[PDB]
């Protein structure tokens, strides 16, 4: 698994740096991210590209396949990562035109971070919804290293426990988002008997989500073994098409989303799932999915973090759908 990456020249006219990882090349101009590899090329609008890059970076390559689009993306092997062009595209695959290279994770991650920093300009926050931030177009103009360097938040057991990830407040830098302005902020009444204060614990989870400063970013709020509650607030469009290497579940907590569901392997449309408050559904391990949300909404993503699953799904010793009836 490869380790060879490289900083290339700052372009004289655009002001941006070009980058290499193995056989892949990365360049941006005023409008586009330009990708090349041995045998081919591809273009992605720079806004779409930066939003997706932002997620793959923040999520540490996430689970399974993170498709930037119908051609380009990554596969997390957990310590190692595959970067591909056309691997999950029927046209490229049938023709033997797909290309992929396997990297050590910190090697690809370091160049991804360099790309994201160089290509992000003053006043553009690739983690926000489009109504909340500026534009990525034009030549290099300052940076937004603060927006792209946010510290990952993960509970070890539950938000708000002594020594675990904290509750969000105005004082610690997390006010309520404009599109959650009406959401009740009161904490639950907690009254512990003496000596038990460490273990009698509750928090307002919806109010916590109302204060999230980013969109489309599942964060662990409670843990039971490998079972992770990873809620997040969402607005506009999930910047990737997620092809998981395990089953996963969505519970809509507020407002609504439609999931565009396509075949993981081919990319062919298969279904559209509309979920309103209280709806819970499952995403099979053989699909990819991408969500859409008009108003900023609350979503619970529920994961099983077990590393045994992908080889089981591959072998057929675990089902591609968790339940049949």
């Amino acid at each position: 698994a490869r380790t060879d990456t490289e900083h290339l020249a700052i372009n004289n006219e655009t002001g941006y740096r070009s980058f290499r990882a193995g056989g892949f090349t990365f360049t941006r101009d005023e409008y586009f991210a330009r990708l090349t590899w041995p045998g081919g090329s591809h273009i992605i609008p720079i806004d779409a590209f930066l939003r997706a890059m932002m997620r793959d970076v923040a999520w540490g390559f996430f689970y399974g396949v993170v498709n930037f689009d119908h051609v380009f993306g990554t596969i997390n092997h957990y310590g190692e990562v595959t970067m591909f062009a056309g691997r999950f595209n029927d046209a490229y695959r049938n023709a033997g035109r797909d290309h992929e290279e396997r990297f050590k994770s910190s090697a690809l991650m370091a160049v991804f971070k360099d790309i994201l920093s160089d290509w992000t300009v003053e006043g553009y926050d690739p983690f926000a919804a489009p109504m909340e931030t500026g534009l990525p177009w034009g030549i290099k103009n300052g940076n937004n290293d603060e927006a792209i360097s946010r510290q990952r938040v993960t509970a070890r057991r539950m938000v708000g426990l002594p020594g675990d990830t904290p509750v969000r407040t105005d004082a610690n830098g997390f006010p309520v988002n404009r599109q959650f302005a009406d959401v009740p902020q009161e904490q639950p009444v907690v009254e512990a008997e003496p000596g038990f204060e460490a273990e009698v614990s509750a928090y307002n989870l919806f109010g916590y989500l109302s204060r999230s400063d980013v969109t489309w970013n599942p964060s662990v709020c409670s843990v039971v073994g490998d079972s992770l509650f990873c809620p997040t607030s969402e607005e506009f469009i999930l910047p990737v098409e997620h092809g998981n290497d395990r089953c996963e579940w969505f519970l809509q907590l507020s407002d609504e989303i439609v999931w565009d569901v396509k075949d993981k392997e081919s990319g062919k449309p298969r279904a559209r799932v509309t979920a309103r408050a209280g709806d819970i559904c499952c995403m099979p391990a053989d699909i990819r999915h991408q969500g859409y949300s008009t108003k900023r909404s609350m979503l619970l993503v529920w994961e099983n973090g077990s590393p045994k699953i992908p080889q089981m799904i591959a072998d057929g010793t675990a089902p591609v759908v968790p339940v049949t009836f």
Partner: protein, 166 residues
């Protein structure tokens, strides 16, 4: 004026699976408020399952019996007001097999132990249910709640009956 739309026992609106080339059964689609509405008070119906782990939905109404578990659990109030009572078990192994998983119904009678405390949850509040504690709930009016847990002696499965088959 911004309106954030939340569900309730008597006020929800199911979406669903629109098909292009699939089986709607693959998406195991239900609404937790509907599931809770049709169930016996404190009946814990699986609405999500991944291997051994589950999410359960329940209507809180009146006072529950006592529960305890060999691992941590979490409860999220989804609708009305739910009171949680916590009791530190003297001998938790007397009520719960340490090798078991998922919640265990340990009887309506008060188990032996010390008072840990009391929690009042409203909609969107999550509380911890720590291993070694016994817990019970009190709701004045019907309210909905969810459990992050493992499938066990209390877990009611009825997929064909709650999920969209279109």
């Amino acid at each position: 004026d911004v309106v954030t739309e939340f569900g309730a026992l008597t006020d929800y609106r199911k979406g669903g699976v629109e098909i292009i080339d699939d089986d709607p059964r693959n998406y195991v689609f239900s609404n937790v408020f509907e599931v809770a509405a049709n169930a016996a008070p404190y009946e814990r119906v699986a609405v999500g399952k991944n291997f051994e782990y589950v999410i359960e939905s329940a209507r809180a109404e009146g006072t529950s019996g006592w529960f305890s578990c060999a691992h941590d659990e979490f409860v999220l109030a989804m609708d009305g007001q739910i009171e949680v009572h916590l009791l530190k078990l003297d001998n938790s192994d007397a009520y719960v097999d340490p090798d078991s998983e998922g919640a265990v119904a340990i009887g309506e009678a008060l188990p032996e132990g010390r008072k840990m405390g009391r929690i009042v949850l409203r909609r969107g509040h999550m509380a911890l249910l720590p291993v070694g504690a016994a817990y019970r709930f009190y709701a004045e009016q019907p309210a909905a709640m969810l459990f992050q847990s493992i499938e066990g002696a209390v877990t009611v499965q009825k997929w064909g009956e709650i999920c969209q088959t279109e």
